[PDB]
Amino acid sequence: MSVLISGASGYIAKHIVRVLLEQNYKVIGTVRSQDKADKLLKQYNNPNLSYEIVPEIANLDAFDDIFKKHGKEIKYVIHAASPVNFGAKDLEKDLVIPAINGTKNMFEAIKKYAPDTVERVVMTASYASIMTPHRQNDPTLTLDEETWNPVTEENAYENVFTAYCASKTFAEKEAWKFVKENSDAVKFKLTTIHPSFVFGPQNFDEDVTKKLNETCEIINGLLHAPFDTKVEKTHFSQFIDVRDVAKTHVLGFQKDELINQRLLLCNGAFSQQDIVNVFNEDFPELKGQFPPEDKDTDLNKGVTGCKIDNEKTKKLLAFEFTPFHKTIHDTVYQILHKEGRV
Numbered sequence: 001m002s003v004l005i006s007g008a009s010g011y012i013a014k015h016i017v018r019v020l021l022e023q024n025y026k027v028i029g030t031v032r033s034q035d036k037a038d039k040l041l042k043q044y045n046n047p048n049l050s051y052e053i054v055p056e057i058a059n060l061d062a063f064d065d066i067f068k069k070h071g072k073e074i075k076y077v078i079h080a081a082s083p084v085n086f087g088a089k090d091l092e093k094d095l096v097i098p099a100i101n102g103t104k105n106m107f108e109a110i111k112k113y114a115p116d117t118v119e120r121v122v123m124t125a126s127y128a129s130i131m132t133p134h135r136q137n138d139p140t141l142t143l144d145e146e147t148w149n150p151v152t153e154e155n156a157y158e159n160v161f162t163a164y165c166a167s168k169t170f171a172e173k174e175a176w177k178f179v180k181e182n183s184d185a186v187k188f189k190l191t192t193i194h195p196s197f198v199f200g201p202q203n204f205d206e207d208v209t210k211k212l213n214e215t216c217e218i219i220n221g222l223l224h225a226p227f228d229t230k231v232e233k234t235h236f237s238q239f240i241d242v243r244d245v246a247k248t249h250v251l252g253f254q255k256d257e258l259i260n261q262r263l264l265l266c267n268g269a270f271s272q273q274d275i276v277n278v279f280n281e282d283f284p285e286l287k288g289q290f291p292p293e294d295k296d297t298d299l300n301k302g303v304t305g306c307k308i309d310n311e312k313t314k315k316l317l318a319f320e321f322t323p324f325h326k327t328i329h330d331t332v333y334q335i336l337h338k339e340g341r342v
């Protein structure tokens with residue numbers, strides 16, 4: 001009944017591991033180094049937790065060794081390893097190849113070493129494989145669980161963000177392709193999770209560092225920006241709370257109605273300024289130590305960009321999502337409390 005989770009040192013995955021351990025699962029995480037494994041084992045201090053070292057998911061047969069050692073005991077796999085790096089300068093090597101090859105490696109290792117043993121795979125895709133990046137501001141576009149980002153290899157590298165979104169899209173396409181082509185040979189059912197921009201506190205307070213993971217660094221950078229920084233007040237994207245994302249991944253292998261589903265995880269549109277407004281509203285004692293409040297945002301004028309039809313996802317998952325204001329509140333409180341400021 002063990003659960004394997006790839007890329008277990010990241011922001012989202014550390015919450016997923018927390019949830020798995022709350023539910024008394026045996027958990028095997030993959031991390032790039034013994035260094036990171038040691039630190040994580042100390043953080044969780046839980047004997048149900050172990051780590052195996054996968055230094056590079058892009059490399060040849062990267063997940064074979066895990067299923068050679070643990071094939072018999074792994075019943076569920078959460079494939080969460082993929083790079084989120086908006087500073088990437090080698091876009092094929094840094095983003096697209098690890099995304100695709102990590103997915104192919106994980107699925108082929110299962111097929112080779114545990115085809116009748118692994119029952120469910122839950123893959124972290126993204127809202128990025130559903131949305132069209134240059135149409136996030138287009139209210140005539142409606143997205144649902146069957147919509148695909150139409151990016152091609154031809155136009156994927158317009159910039160680092162389209163390249164990251166293409167990495168997500170191409171990896172996901174390979175997963176469904178594998179599932180369709182091996183439905184007779186491998187037992188597992190696939191579920192894909194599609195979070196939008198993920199905010200919320202780090203699983204451990206000690207992981208509030210100078211620079212956070214990419215998506216929470218949006219909040220962290222705004223919170224520490226000089227007062228006169230220019231803050232954009234136009235629609236940016238959709239968000240989802242990291243704790244909702246983690247809860248969804250675990251439900252993903254437990255609930256039969258999530259089999260063969262793409263789950264679209266959005267709970268609200270936002271601008272950078274809507275984030276900053278929470279700073280000022282909820283910590284008025286600190287006003288002036290970060291950019292000021294401004295209620296003239298796209299959101300407040302009824303401007304939310306492309307429309308999210310995730311009613312099916314919300315109905316299947318049944319639990320209520322965390323609202324934007326609380327998600328930002330808890331992210332900011334964690335940082336400022338860590339700093340001794342509140």
Ligand SMILES: NC(=O)c1ccc[n+]([C@@H]2O[C@H](COP(=O)([O-])OP(=O)(O)OC[C@H]3O[C@@H](n4cnc5c(N)ncnc54)[C@H](OP(=O)(O)O)[C@@H]3O)[C@@H](O)[C@H]2O)c1
Nearest residue numbers: 007009010011012056057081082083098126197198213215
């Ligand atoms: N944050 C969001 O808004 C969001 C939205 C949609 C989907 N997702 C997806 O959620 C998953 C985790 O994202 P995150 O926000 O938690 O980012 P993160 O904190 O940077 O975690 C990424 C994890 O994947 C590992 N990883 C990345 N590339 C790897 C590679 N080539 N080889 C081995 N390990 C690799 C990372 O390990 P190292 O740190 O050691 O490199 C880390 O453990 C990703 O699949 C991401 O695409 C995130």
